[PDB]
Amino acid sequence: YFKIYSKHTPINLVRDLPQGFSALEPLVDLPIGINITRFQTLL
Amino acid sequence: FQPTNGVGYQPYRVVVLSFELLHAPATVCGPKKSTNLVKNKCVNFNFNGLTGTGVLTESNKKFLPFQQFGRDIADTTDAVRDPQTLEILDITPCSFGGV
Numbered sequence: 001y002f003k004i005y006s007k008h009t010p011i012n013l014v015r016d017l018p019q020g021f022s023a024l025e026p027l028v029d030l031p032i033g034i035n036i037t038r039f040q041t042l043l
Numbered sequence: 044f045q046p047t048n049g050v051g052y053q054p055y056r057v058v059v060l061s062f063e064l065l066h067a068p069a070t071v072c073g074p075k076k077s078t079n080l081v082k083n084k085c086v087n088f089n090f091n092g093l094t095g096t097g098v099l100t101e102s103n104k105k106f107l108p109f110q111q112f113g114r115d116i117a118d119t120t121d122a123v124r125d126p127q128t129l130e131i132l133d134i135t136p137c138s139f140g141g142v
């Protein structure tokens with residue numbers, strides 16, 4: 001089961017992750033049963 | 044598998060049912076007929092198999108779009124979401140005390 005949590009927030013910073021605290025809430029739980037060991041991003 | 048094989052060697056068809064509660068809505072349910080909801084009264088409630096006894100009242104809690112039921116420090120259900128109505132209900136244990 002592939003659980004996907006997420007969180008969106010406005011920011012004003014061009015360097016790196018802003019420092020602070022915020023929690024990510026679950027949004028999806030896919031019953032895939034697909035074994036995973038690698039991933040990649042697409043822009 | 045020959046038809047003359049001993050019953051210990053004869054073919055047997057096997058089906059295994061496994062039940063699963065996920066971090067997702069419960070979509071498999073039994074045929075038990077549902078009933079109307081009663082509030083501000085002591086009742087024996089069964090919400091999607093979450094069974095108990097108490098008084099159901101309108102809550103001011105804020106469940107997230109996914110949350111189905113709350114809990115208390117005792118690990119007892121403190122509130123729930125009605126499967127048929129997107130509302131949150133507080134469970135107060137039925138009044139009791141020494142006599």
Ligand SMILES: *[C@@H]1O[C@H](CO)[C@@H](O)[C@H](O)[C@H]1NC(C)=O
Nearest residue numbers: 077124125126127128129130
């Ligand atoms: C079934 O429950 C949903 C709750 O989201 C409600 O919107 C809908 O009207 C209900 N249907 C019937 C036939 O009661």
